[PDB]
From a paper:
Na+/H+ exchangers facilitate the exchange of monovalent cations (Na+/Li+/K+) and protons (H+) across membranes to regulate intracellular pH, sodium levels and cell volume. Na+/H+ exchangers that perform this task are physiological homodimers, and whilst the ion transporting domain is highly conserved, their dimerization differs. The transporter is made up of two distinct domains, a dimerization domain and an ion-transporting (core) domain. Here, we report cryo-EM structures of E. coli NhaA and [name] [name] in complex with cardiolipin and phosphatidylinositol-3,5-bisphosphate PI(3,5)P2 lipids binding at their respective dimer interfaces.
Here, we instead performed the collection of [name]* at pH 6.5 where [name] is thought to be less active, and therefore presumably less dynamic. Overall, we collected ~4300 movies and the final 3D-reconstruction contained data of ~244,300 particles, from which an EM map could be reconstructed to 3.3 Å according to the gold-standard Fourier shell correlation (FSC) 0.143 criterion. Selecting 42% of the particles for heterogeneous refinement, enabled an improved cryo-EM map reconstruction of [name]* at pH 6.5, with additional map features for the TM2-TM3 loop domain. For model building we therefore generated a composite map, by combining the maps before and after masked refinement, with an overall resolution estimate of 3.6 Å, although the final model resolution is worse at 4.0 Å resolution. We were able to refine the overall position of the short linker and β-hairpin strand predicted from the AlphaFold228 model. The loop domain reconnects to the beginning of TM3 via a short extracellular helix (ECH1), which was well supported by the cryo-EM maps. The β-hairpins were predicted by AlphaFold228 to be domain-swapped, and this structure refines well into the map density. The centre of the loop domain has a cluster of positively-charged residues K105, K107 and R108 from each of the two protomers. Overall, the TM2-TM3 β-loop domain clasps the two protomers together on the luminal side and forms a highly positively-charged cluster that is positioned above the dimerization domain interface. As such, the improved [name]* structure is consistent with its previously proposed requirement for binding negatively-charged PIP2 lipids at the interface.
Author numbering:
A (entry chain B), B (entry chain A): 17 to 496, 518 to 546
Write the structure that this text describes.
């Protein structure tokens, strides 16, 4: 053995060093760096010192066998050797036999992770923690604004990024860097959808530490929570798009079915999450598990995991379903659990979220582990930077003005610049980029996204405090109907009229 | 996808049903059944209803390719199809091509788990929880007795079981059930070492619920904690034994080196655990992490995991190292953490232990999932039952009398019968049996161990209360030097003289 133990120990040591450095920085109050940035820089240092440590070594090349009557590559295969049948499993495709002697040199440790690990065990805890951690104060008078942002602006930014990337691809074809025809507008739309999820975790941490006005913090948190799921589902829908004939056509009568599939997946995920939440709320309400905190906590965790697994198995997107289940749980079941169970669940979920985000950023800081990197064509990177900048610019101001037209007597002026400055890219974009491999445009997009994240997270973590001071943003503020489209008040009345007396308000807490 | 999600959802549903049934049983105070027994019976029911659900189906047979120039089976292989190289990984060997048409029928869902999962992610949490959960009261005046039991009695029971199994194998050869020569005394020793770990989890739960005299409870808990690691290391040492010539010989000059390897592995694991514990204790003592419960809790968890990983990568046994690290942590670092961090760590570890044991017992009840079962030869099962009974009989009474000779003025009389009745076999034996496969004696031993566990856990859970009432064991008792071999007092004085003032007694808690 002694294969995964070494890499896991290295990851643990890097996490310990990151925690120690964060404690040292916070002791001197230097700031200018977050735990995510520390983890990423430590991962970069580890990769740099591992790449150039034992590069001169032997060359290992795998043997080639001429397997006759083999026109397909099944996932599972049975090979009969010495009158004994052995099972072989297909894992990954490596089509770099030409550079195989170079790959053998400086092999060191691959330290690679399966792309589904980030989607099955790392992201869902973070999504559930984000959904459950609702202040339950405010976030409702501006809920419509958050929804309008996270819906319209994400699509607008995706379209703008796709158009600008298509234009830059045309310019490159004019320059003739490589072959013309490989890139397509579908790839541009995929890249735009991928570069639409924002997770300003450092910005949110700074806002919480400095006690900024809760309105801007709630708006940013809601946007970051919703746009991640919106971008994930949009990326899945774009990946579904496949015309029957004339590939990469325009208006091939498949837009309507793609939109229908998107709406159906979103509605199914929301319905499944709500159904699981109401089922567990009713189960807790009828039972008297308030005297057994361990049993009710375990039941809650198992029910949440079962909801996630049911969402994944049904063919829908598990992230959005988990988010909706978590927010509905925090809305309803939080008033029925015992006092100790609430604290236990909150501590467990926040610890899991912290560990998951630390591991995610530590692995993201590892940039030298991938041999199939395509970091070149600086014009492409510059075009991507301009596209994301202009997409962020057009996301806020037009929607902000449109909301200010029918504004609810609360003008959010001068806060748009802070939203412009908060343009971090979270783990969703990295996971989506790393999901697809062995493709030149995919590798180029992954490298560009990684470089953009490395630049933007560091620069915005460095400049958040000067930006806050320059805009005269109020800090240190203690947290302690008709205007709402006439629909939010009706929903609140309906909830307090029928749902509340049956789902809660009775039973020992 | 939709492969692991279905089985995980089935596991979650089984766990929920087990929890509901346990709550129903506890509401009526019927008892006579534990959560482990409920999980096992639910798994058995699920296996029974899954085996006979869709048995009539098609026959699937894997294709066979004549791969020339292939005299070995590498773990990783590279196959060139259509001028593209694909990586194939060797997973498992299935040498049942003759019964392959039968295997294809009623395939259903394999729901199998990797044998190293039980050793890398399931057992270590349970071991760490058991080591950390020390009462810190008593357990020291009888520590020598616990050590003498867990060391001498385990070896005596292993020897007795091996001798009796060898005798029964000779009797079978006389009866001529199968070929003579396949079995060996080494296999008997392996079986004896495997059938030496006792985990009376139901008995411990009953004792804790009924508030029995703490002396017997502490003795049983210490024996169950120590003998698991003792048996694991003994089994590893037995597996190491391999004579150079004349295989399965007696006194081949390898007993001395095997004992030396056993002692070295145990000493190295203990030293590594103690080193990690003192390192984290000093790190907590010097730092002021009492104001950051999240940071110190995460650091503690990461340090424990890193200690486990270092033990695994060092070539030693990780279970014993984890146990020693946990007990040393509970001894030293528990007095340095903040008041909230202690509760957070305890709740997290107890929840992890509960989930791990529930999953272990749910999977253990699945007996019909393994197609390569060898449940026959009832004489072998009867011999194993007699061997384990006589091993339990000879483990307690001789050692009890020897301790009563130089007894520390506290005669533990009439408690030996209860220790005889508590003869449960825990997850260690099942994991050791399932580690090795594709071998007729190994399969027979695994089947016999599974049947013995299924019988003994259920019968002892049913009969613990009548046994407790018959022996007039005191219940309901509230918990609130020279006699100790003259060495325990010296150790206590040394700890309180030098180690305590530096490791603890200073710093904000």
């Amino acid at each position: 053995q002694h294969q995964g133990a070494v890499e896991l120990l290295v990851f643990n040591f890097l996490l310990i060093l990151t925690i120690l450095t964060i404690w040292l920085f916070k002791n001197h109050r230097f700031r200018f760096l977050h735990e995510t940035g520390g983890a990423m820089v430590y991962g970069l240092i580890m990769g740099l010192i591992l790449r150039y440590a034992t590069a001169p070594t032997d060359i290992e090349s795998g043997t080639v066998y001429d397997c006759g009557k083999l026109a397909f590559s099944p996932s599972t295969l049975l090979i009969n050797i010495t009158d004994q049948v052995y099972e072989y499993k297909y894992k990954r495709e490596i089509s770099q036999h030409n550079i195989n002697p170079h790959l053998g040199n400086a092999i060191l440790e691959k330290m690679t992770f399966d792309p589904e690990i980030f989607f099955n065990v790392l992201l869902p805890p973070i999504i559930f923690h984000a959904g459950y951690s609702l202040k339950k104060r405010h976030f409702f008078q501006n809920l419509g604004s958050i929804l309008t942002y996270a819906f319209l602006g994400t699509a607008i930014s995706c379209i703008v990024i796709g158009l600008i990337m298509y234009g830059f691809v045309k310019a490159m074809v004019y320059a003739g860097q490589l072959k013309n025809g490989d890139f397509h507008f579908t790839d541009c739309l995929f890249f735009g959808s991928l570069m639409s999820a924002t997770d300003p975790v450092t910005v949110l941490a700074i806002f919480h530490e400095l006690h900024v006005d809760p309105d801007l913090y709630t708006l940013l948190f809601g946007e970051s929570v919703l746009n991640d799921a919106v971008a994930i589902v949009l990326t899945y829908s774009i990946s579904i798009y496949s015309p029957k004939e004339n590939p990469n056509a325009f208006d091939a009568a498949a837009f309507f079915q793609s939109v229908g599939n998107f709406l159906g997946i979103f509605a199914g995920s929301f319905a499944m999450g709500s159904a699981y939440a109401v089922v567990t709320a009713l189960l807790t309400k009828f039972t008297k598990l308030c005297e057994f905190p361990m049993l009710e906590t375990g039941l809650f965790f198992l029910l949440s995991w079962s909801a996630f697994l049911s969402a994944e198995a049904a063919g829908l997107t598990g992230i959005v379903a988990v988010l909706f289940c978590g927010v509905t749980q925090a809305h309803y079941t939080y008033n029925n659990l015992s006092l100790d169970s609430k604290m236990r669940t909150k501590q467990l979920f926040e610890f899991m979220n912290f560990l998951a985000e630390n591991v995610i950023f530590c692995y993201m800081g590892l940039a030298l582990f991938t041999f199939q990197n395509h970091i070149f064509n600086a014009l492409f990177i510059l075009g991507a930077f301009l596209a994301i900048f202009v997409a962020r610019a057009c996301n806020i101001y037009p929607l902000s003005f449109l909301l200010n037209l029918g504004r609810k007597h609360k003008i959010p002026w001068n806060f748009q610049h802070m939203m412009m400055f908060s343009g971090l890219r979270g783990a969703i974009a990295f996971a989506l980029a790393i999901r697809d491999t062995e493709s030149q445009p995919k590798q180029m997009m992954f490298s560009t996204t990684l470089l953009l994240v490395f630049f933007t997270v560091w620069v915005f973590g460095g400049g958040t405090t000067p930006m806050l001071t320059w805009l005269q943003i109020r800090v240190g503020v203690d947290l302690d109907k008709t205007e709402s489209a006439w629909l939010f008040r009706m929903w609140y009345g309906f909830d307090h009229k029928y749902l509340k007396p049956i789902l809660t308000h009775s039973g020992p807490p």
